From a paper:
The yeast diadenosine and diphosphoinositol polyphosphate phosphohydrolase DDP1 is a Nudix enzyme with pyrophosphatase activity on diphosphoinositides, dinucleotides, and polyphosphates. ScDDP1, like its human orthologs, adopts the canonical Nudix fold showing two β sheets flanked by helices. The active site lies in the crevice situated between both β sheets. The longest helix (α-1) contains the Nudix box (GX5EX7REUXEEXGU), which displays a β-loop-helix-loop structure that binds the Mg2+ ions involved in diphosphate moiety orientation and catalysis.
Author numbering: 22 to 165
Write the structure that this text describes.
């Protein structure tokens, strides 16, 4: 039920850089694969979905119980990895303004969630070994 690139054959994923009204803090969730690594909400595009905004906002709700307004398109980043060969993932990110953070959401028992300063969020994605996600974060309007 997943969607792949007709060029690279890379898996199409969409996610959100969820920033507060003041643009000081960003919403991070713990990885499911590894419980101590901090990432941002994102997930596979599905066949029915008409655009990437739909995937982004769906995954943002499921993984982080975040509701908000998409204010910007941060373009794409790739999971370019060791050796040669095409990327495995093509990520489409959007900046979202956090309107509401719900206590309950589909994966609130599988993950932790917390607002971080730019400084600490940058360290977390390094620690998490996800510089593609840090690229996307740096494209946002976060204060540093
Ligand atoms: O759908 P899968 O084939 O299981 O893909 C998983 C899944 O990615 P998605 O969220 O995009 O589905 C993991 O994310 P979780 O939802 O389990 O958190 C992600 O782990 P991260 O949490 O680090 O993103 C992991 O990537 P990794 O290679 O780091 O294990 C990735 O595997 P793929 O390489 O097959 O995409
Ligand atoms: Mg996911």
């Amino acid at each position: 039920n997943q969607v792949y690139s007709p060029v690279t054959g890379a898996r199409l994923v969409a996610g959100c850089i969820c920033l507060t009204p003041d643009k000081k803090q960003v919403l991070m969730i713990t990885s499911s694969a590894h419980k101590k690594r901090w990432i941002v909400p994102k997930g596979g595009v599905e066949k029915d979905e008409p655009n990437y905004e739909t995937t982004a906002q769906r995954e943002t709700w499921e993984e982080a119980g975040c509701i908000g307004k998409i204010v910007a398109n941060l373009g794409t980043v790739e999971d370019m990895r060791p050796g040669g060969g095409p990327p495995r993932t093509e990520f489409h990110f959007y900046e979202l303004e956090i309107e509401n953070l719900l206590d309950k959401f589909p994966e609130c028992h599988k993950r932790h969630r917390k607002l971080y300063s730019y400084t600490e969020a940058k360290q977390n994605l390094i620690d998490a070994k996800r510089p593609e996600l840090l690229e996307a974060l740096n494209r946002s309007a976060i204060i540093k």
